[PDB]
Design a protein around this ligand. Sequence first.
Ligand SMILES: *[C@@H]1O[C@H](CO)[C@@H](O)[C@H](O)[C@H]1NC(C)=O
Ligand SMILES: [Cl-]
Length: 103
Amino acid sequence: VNYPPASVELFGESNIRYGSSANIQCKSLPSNPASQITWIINGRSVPTPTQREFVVENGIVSSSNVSVHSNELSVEAHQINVECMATNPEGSSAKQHVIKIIA
Ligand SMILES: *[C@@H]1O[C@H](CO)[C@@H](O)[C@H](O)[C@H]1NC(C)=O
Ligand SMILES: [Cl-]
């Protein structure tokens, strides 16, 4: 009856020009109860401004869209490591997405 999200779906630009932002979307796989989306940029948590929840047959999908801005403090070794985590009381799952900053 209750179970954690089995994984997350992570979509977005994989290469962007320095100074621009990448549109990143995270969608949890279905969970019960609903999961909270947390974002991690280069190893540190950042706010989740909004998340949107949908019901499916199994449980609930949580979705969050963010824009990741590339600048001198967010870029490390010419990339940005983005991780999305989906957590409910039964456990959590996560995926990472690497944004390359092109020269
Ligand atoms: C989130 O982004 C996806 C494309 O990556 C888009 O289809 C969807 O409508 C967006 N949702 C919101 C609330 O912006
Ligand atoms: Cl791309």
